[model samples]
Target: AESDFEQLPDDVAISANIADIEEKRGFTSHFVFVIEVKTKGGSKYLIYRRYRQFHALQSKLEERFGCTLPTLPAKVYVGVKQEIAEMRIPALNAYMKSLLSLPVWVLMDEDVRIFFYQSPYDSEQVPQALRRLRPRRMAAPRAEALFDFTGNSKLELNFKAGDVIFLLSRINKDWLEGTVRGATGIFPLSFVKILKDFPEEDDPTNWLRCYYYEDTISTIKDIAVEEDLSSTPLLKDLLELTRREFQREDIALNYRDAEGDLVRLLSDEDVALMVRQARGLPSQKRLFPWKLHITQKD
Candidate 1:
């Protein structure tokens, strides 16, 4: 059974909590846990430990407590190592909790004490935890196009028959965000056979992640205009859409480069570069996907 405490406090007020795990890279590799520790005085620090470290600690602990000792997640190497590492994080965290829940004197043992002990490295300033910025889990569906779909808007995808699409997110019950031939956009679900289905959810709005977009000008508005426009847009599609948006008078689509010069977007690549350059701007909130500089070209 899993341990009850995610983190357990001991007599000295010291505790260890497992945060995450990853497989080591290089010629030799194994899974390791990223641990966060809190000292008696409330100081916090991080450390990296391997599965074998926990195994060794468990062996020592078993000599102390037999039937009551908590079980550790069994090691597996056949499946995806990273996947296994992710699953083991919570289990290893549970193990640490059980270990620290032991008698005060047991925690004082040199071997066990060192696990929660802070080092010089802990004194070094570390960035704040940004785990929330990580991508939320989503169902990745894959499918193949049954017919050619020449995209109508910036949001729609253009792909030929037989092209494979790795579906990213659902635009609606009928449309989905998918990538084909290096480009990503929304397409009608009826146009393809679903080789896989996204993760089942009670409501689509409950999903944690979404793509934000904007039109010409400095306004960084969320693409709530069209559910489909929220995904990555193509240059041609964006240009055409912008023209249709402000069709009151003839306007030219231009983007400012690093040198602050208006560069005419001759093709789709220029549009992509414009978006990339905008992302590099100091303020993302004010990023303009593209700009309209009213000019008539020869």
Candidate 2:
């Protein structure tokens, strides 16, 4: 264990980006940085967080793990709060940029994970109308419009036949969202050829994933991406999901620690400990640091 000290460093440029900032309204309005985060496996989602969350993550790292950090941009009490937010966007982004660059294990830690992940609360806090102030360009399908197309809504693109559209994402079979020059919106698929395509949320920490249909004890390594729900789901929720997905209520979820002992997730704290202990394990190159086994008493 002492020999395996170095962690797999996360590539912030490809895996994470601070895309934009928006104001969260309240008595005294505040702002959140909308971060675009993706796993190496191509799973992507947005994280909405404030400076306080960043400070908490930084402080926790320092005290608990004896980790060093780039100082968070100073919080200003007196100023036109809007411009204050404007300036801090870059500063806060730079802070997280270097923070992620420090230790890959820190990226996997619960506090840091929660900060970067879009939580159920974050979904509610970020209002219905304004999730993305800009397009999230995950896919790269540089398509050229075959025919002239016109769209009604502001979210729809108006394009000429010869103009090229940079593919941002797929909306459905018939229509897709793309960027033509500066404008981005939904447009008909018939108007554009398959410059390229591939298949498909939340950073579904689990979707509480489980598998039980197999005859022998088969392990479900990892899964899922939906936009809403807790990435750090409680033990009960995981069990409940296993019950439904596997169609049997009689099963348990267990994971191995660095010391090679299998432990059952009986409580939320147990789940947290699993997150912490998995970080100390050797870098196995799996997308998820931990893997779970489904056991049935036959």
Identify the leading candidate in terms of lDDT.
2
Model 1, span 47-76: residue lDDT tens? 667666678777887786542567786656
The C-alpha TM-scores of every prediction are: 0.35, 0.38
Candidate 1, position 138, lDDT: 25
Top model number, TM-score? 2
Over all chains combined, what TM-score does candidate 2 have?
Answer: 0.38
lDDT of 2 at 156: 83
Error of 1 at 294 (Å): 70
RMSD (Cα, Å) for all candidates, in order, is 18.2, 17.7
